[PDB]
Symmetry: D2
Subunit: 386 residues, 4 copies
């Protein structure tokens, strides 16, 4: 009956179930949640852990004694429930000081502050046991062309991430960074708008091994991209350090629907890929129960994230294990896709008349790929209609 | 009066002005053009050069004597006009044999053929003087999730590009590759869908220095991305080896409108960036005169590509040179964006109380960015309303 | 096992299974199909009938004796199989003469020709028993703003549809028209781009009762719209005279995937609505088997259209019949949505202090809508995970 | 120098310049503005008037004496400046009670409250001289398919608008309604998502003459539609009762950029159409100065809305008056588009062999439309490059 348990490694941000329902056009529809109560409620649903921005756990501007008490209460909730904290992050987007960015603000003093605020929370993240430190630069970008020279902004972005790498190395921490792309919202265009742009940027950092990506289902879908394809490219690069699961209906504002809502078939192929690849990180949900809901609906929406992942995991495993699917995959030459093109080497390929001079293009063109029969087997498995 | 001359380095594909007007739903509206006549017509408009797919210059399936005569006539047109050939590419998308891809076809024999067809045309490209060899993998991708394992496809894609690098190195050629991303069309999703994905992929090739990107205005806009921002990231990476200029209205089929049509302000900021950065490659137009047009409209549409680039070049230069704009850029702290965040180093930043303990977040938050006044100066310059 | 039979009223266009695979960037991948063979193959799959454009049944430019023989052979196939022809339409988009439109071409002679070509095929449609005559104005529109004055084009569009109404009335035919909106492709923008625009236009025709809409799943999705919502508005207006079923992944070129592919949950809610509303027209598929496929894949893709509709019909019926869903719908106040707001009348509402002066906004705001629990019951029914 | 004066009829909502900068992810960046100060500032810029939601002028929950004082101060500002109030509207979206809608909330008590809150503000609107009463149902819609039966919601929506028509008629008011479509945001899908859907809905009201549309540039662009085309359809229907001007970059969250930003060429063709059609309503700006700005940037952004409209008005008038453009419009057969197709009548068309039997399709197909030369004249006029 698709019941999650902590061994399934499902995690949730405090800001997800704790979202009060404020949007562009609307006031809060739910009261604030104490993080203690969200840890207890999430544990009762079978979650493994929780994640936080600095300012979700400790109100911005807290004194040291207030900070200590917020952390003490949260630690007690973690210890009472067995919940973990595998990931933490910094809020470099809510406060008005970040209206033009944190790490790429035009004001230099704001960039230095953003770094100090991040470093303070990396120390806390390590104390709470986090292995991954996410960075979503939601304010890095522009609404107009003259406001932001992107080459200078990328120079500032590299300096900031290099300084954070130097800091973790200096402290001997075993935490790694996961950069979260998004194409737009709240900025008109956000820097590092997709998984590809973030992977490319990481290759230019001083210590690329310290950084990966934290892709989000709905973010890549806001650019109309195929989320499973982008996760495959991140896995191919060895850079899937964390993932954010939710639902999105295409090219709109970021909806943050529960996982399995939005593009259902993309959710199926995502689960198939994570499970086939043996991804071992948390399955983290960055979602918002809709503001129509009361607290009972918040917990139902959170439970539905995990249930949908487990249903899709069963159907993807049955698809890949079905001998009729295995035969269809060979009929569609998925086995040949996995064989090297020319392990015989360049000169052998140049000398091979079967590759050019004596290649029958028309007989190869006539061979159907059989992809529709394979896809309807996938449909039938997903719908339980075999 | 914005008259282009060959010194402006404007280039056009044979397939652009030569497009006969066939689309998803329509037969040709114009007769085929002899490449000789397109070289002559383009030279008369002030173009610098032309580009080609193999199969635009030599019909697919030509004998050696037919091939020699097509090349001889084209060379004579180039010599009669002074036109150059700075770029060439392979057609790995029209023939039905490429229905599942060239370099990432599931059929191995098709992948080997795609490589041999590419290598034959690299030799011709070098004979005609091309410095850049573009690769647009328009058939690499899928319409369904089971049809294409993307990690295996990227392994095949890397093998293919590595073999092409080994080939050019083996021959001592001074040609470089430019990979052209596109998010979709004709495949439901195309592999390497954006500039970021292509830049990331190149970093994993055996000899990354041989490869850059060939971004196209309309391709990045089909994902709703900011094309000038993506060009800035490619320039930041040192990888803008070629560029395709055209117009697109957002998230649709690839419209291939003349340059300056589609998103006009994005065309302005693109020209501003290419000119500020001192980009020295061809300004290449990959566009289609609409099928409503006769040949006079084809040449008017081609002339309009160049005219719009030259108008936008004048207005962007006037914007950057205007002392009132220079003052607005300082008021918006574009100068501070270009200064290192912490050249004093990590420990100095950690010890700097002005970056945290004594940073007045509210006074920094209250300082307006003045971006709207700067953007209306940019508007006024673009519209000639100063 | 979800086996369709003719009683299910599934229909297919000749151009669907008969699509040879030519696209923007590619030559045909399959040979042409004789309409006789498509009628036989579709009947064997359990289809009810077929539909046609004039030029799919009779090649454009046929002599009268050729026309008679094409019609005779097609009639024999219909009689051999028991297949019906419930709908026909005109091709006013392929021939180059329609490059600027049929009914709204700027050239008046082309508009008059488009009307004569339509009227000739209305007579044939009636002879073959069609009840619905579709009109998809795929060439009505523009790529540039000066090319098409839209108020004048709508005047021409109304004249054309009014003349077609006068013609059918004059002949005593019992056929009705169904106008098919599309937002773009092949024109940069198409006139009557959505269901709403077409419904609005029909209200201004001389005899609106003769006209309804023929919405297509993928067309409304090319504008990012909710297809079930648009079908609900057409049903509310009494104007769903025909429907085109297929799949689409959001905002791209028109993919024409088999029904159930693309947005699966939207396919579920569409079937739920058509079945709840008692829609009695054909379930018509306007799709294209992908060009990767051979003929066996064409028939598998066609069979999959019908199978997916039948699976979704079973799951939507089980959802609506489940007493736990019925209780959830009452908890979410779907029953109250169906009750008049103020059957007591305006003055009673004005005098009702419970509607204003004594309405407790905070107690009403606090009541959760319970929509997430209702939606996860819908998910569980769709996936067979109850 | 493009200086607006009140005779230009530019109007602004209090909520536009008064937007404090709160978004999905961010706190306010500017202090609240007193409506008195916004009226004074807008008048100094040359605006004609202002518009309001009920709750922008009178805080929600005000006592009668507070209400009277807010209205008294606002009236004094209007009288001090000569500013008008041509339009008002109701806020049926911010308060949590409207989380599922106002007029189509599933809770009947909320629907009755939404009507009473609207009617109270219609009385105030009439006292302040408004001729148009806008209704943007931003909360009407859903995030999930079971939550909202759209046929029942449209029944509730018609009841509500019919009751409002009965109310204005009963009071003898000369105010008319303008329904504002939007496709999504804040709801996952909003009911009446485009101009077409709203026009269609109005035709089913009891007294359609009382209702028109209030289209917004950015709303239609959030569906990827052509805003000038949609305004042309509203003008063709006689239903453009008000218009909201702003900028948007395609398919994203609603950006509300100043008018002229976003799609510049669409802004040009919009101004060309409003001015050619002799639209006589207010040119209203529904925009948000970006939250990066301080108050000086708010007023610069507001001034830029008006400046851009006046620049585009000059360039569109010069385009239409240029004898070379007039010749190009005849070469493109825009004159023939405006002539009836068959004023000779149906039987004459049927008997006309020049329309079918003797129509030379190939000679008509060969005639180019000359649209690219016409569009580059439009480009040159817009850019001041003639
Ligand atoms: Co998100
Ligand atoms: Co996230
Ligand atoms: Co293109
Ligand atoms: Co290109
Ligand atoms: Co379609
Ligand atoms: Co269709
Ligand atoms: Co808006
Ligand atoms: Co508005």
């Amino acid at each position: 009956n698709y019941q999650p348990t902590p061994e399934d490694r499902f995690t949730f941000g405090l800001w997800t179930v704790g979202w009060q329902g404020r949007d562009p056009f609307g006031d809060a529809t739910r009261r604030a949640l104490d993080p203690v109560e969200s840890v207890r409620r999430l544990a009762e649903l079978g979650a493994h852990g929780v994640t936080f921005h600095d300012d979700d756990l400790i109100p911005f501007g807290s004194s040291d004694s207030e900070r200590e008490e917020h952390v003490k209460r949260f630690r007690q909730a973690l210890d009472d429930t067995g919940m973990k904290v595998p990931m933490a992050t910094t809020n470099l987007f809510t406060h008005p000081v970040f209206k033009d960015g944190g790490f790429t603000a035009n004001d230099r003093d704001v960039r230095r502050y953003a770094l100090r605020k991040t470093i303070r929370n990396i120390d806390l993240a390590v104390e709470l046991g986090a292995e991954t430190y996410v960075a979503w630069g939601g304010r890095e970008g522009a609404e107009s062309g003259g406001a932001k020279d992107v080459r200078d902004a990328l120079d500032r972005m590299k300096e900031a991430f290099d300084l954070l790498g130097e800091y973790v190395t200096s402290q001997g921490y075993d935490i790694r960074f996961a950069i979260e792309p998004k194409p737009n919202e709240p900025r008109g265009d956000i820097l590092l708008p997709t998984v590809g742009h973030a992977l490319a940027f990481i290759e230019r950092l001083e210590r690329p091994e310290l950084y990966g990506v934290n892709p989000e289902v709905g973010h890549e879908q806001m650019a109309g991209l195929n989320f499973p394809h982008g996760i495959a490219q991140a896995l191919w690069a060895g850079k899937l350090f964390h993932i954010d699961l939710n639902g999105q209906n295409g090219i709109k504002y970021d909806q943050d629907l529960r996982f399995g809502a939005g593009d259902l078939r993309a959710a199926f192929w995502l689960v198939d890929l994570l499970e086939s690849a043996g991804y071992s990180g948390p399955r983290h949900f960055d979602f918002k129960p809709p503001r129509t809901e009361d607290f009972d609906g918040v917990w139902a929406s959170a439970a539905g994230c995990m249930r949908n992942y487990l249903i899709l995991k069963e159907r993807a495993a049955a698809f890949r294990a079905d001998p009729e699917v295995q035969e269809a995959l060979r009929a569609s030459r998925l086995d040949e896709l996995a064989r090297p093109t020319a392990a015989d080497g360049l000169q052998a390929l140049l000398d091979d008349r079967s590759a050019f001079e004596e290649f029958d293009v028309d007989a190869a063109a006539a061979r159907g790929m059989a992809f529709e029969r394979l896809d309807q087997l996938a449909m039938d498995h997903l719908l339980g209609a075999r």
